[PDB]
Amino acid sequence: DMYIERAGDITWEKDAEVTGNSPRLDVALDESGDFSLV
Amino acid sequence: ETTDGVYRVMTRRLLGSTQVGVGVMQEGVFHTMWHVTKGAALRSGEGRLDPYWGDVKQDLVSYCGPWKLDAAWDGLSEVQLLAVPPGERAKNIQTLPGIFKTKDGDIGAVALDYPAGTSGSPILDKCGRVIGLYGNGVVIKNGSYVSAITQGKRE
Numbered sequence A: 001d002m003y004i005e006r007a008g009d010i011t012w013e014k015d016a017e018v019t020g021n022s023p024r025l026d027v028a029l030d031e032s033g034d035f036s037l038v
Numbered sequence B: 001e002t003t004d005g006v007y008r009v010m011t012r013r014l015l016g017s018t019q020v021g022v023g024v025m026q027e028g029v030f031h032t033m034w035h036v037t038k039g040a041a042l043r044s045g046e047g048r049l050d051p052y053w054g055d056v057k058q059d060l061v062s063y064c065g066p067w068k069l070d071a072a073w074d075g076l077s078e079v080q081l082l083a084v085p086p087g088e089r090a091k092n093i094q095t096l097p098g099i100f101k102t103k104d105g106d107i108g109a110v111a112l113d114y115p116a117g118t119s120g121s122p123i124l125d126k127c128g129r130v131i132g133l134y135g136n137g138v139v140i141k142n143g144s145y146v147s148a149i150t151q152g153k154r155e
């Protein structure tokens, strides 16, 4: 059995760390819901 | 409890307490990704949450009601991933989404890597609306992980 417990509020933080790039990827989505690269 | 917010999804079929995923509670409905729970019912203290809608191809599932989250990324602004890593505190990460280019159109994508138990963490716009869930994506050349911004359809 699975259960849930609260982890925080849904809110934007102004002092948040900024990281991560913004790649353009050609992908395909199959019937099972898995993405794959083209 | 049905309080709005972000929640961990835990199990005990394995060793100790294990976090399989994350979800958001809004308007009495719990939203997570399908691969996290596989449509199984959930426990909330003394109460119980049963699946209401789900789709394996979208990799989304909702509990107690229909999908409520309908905000969309504008395609321009940066967003924040409210990551809930297993065993660690919730932490916001701001980032500029990339693009998943498919035959059916384009969807935003976030290039942030976290343990798989973070699947279901919400992605927010600057107004604080949930524009999608994190945890269904690909692995690119370098070996890092890029997740789509997976959003459902209200009504």
Ligand SMILES: OCn1cnc2ccccc21
Pocket (backbone or CB within 6 Å): B112, B113, B114, B115, B116, B118, B119, B134, B135, B136, B145, B147
């Ligand atoms: O960041 C969520 N996530 C879901 N599946 C993953 C696989 C590898 C790294 C991260 C993953």
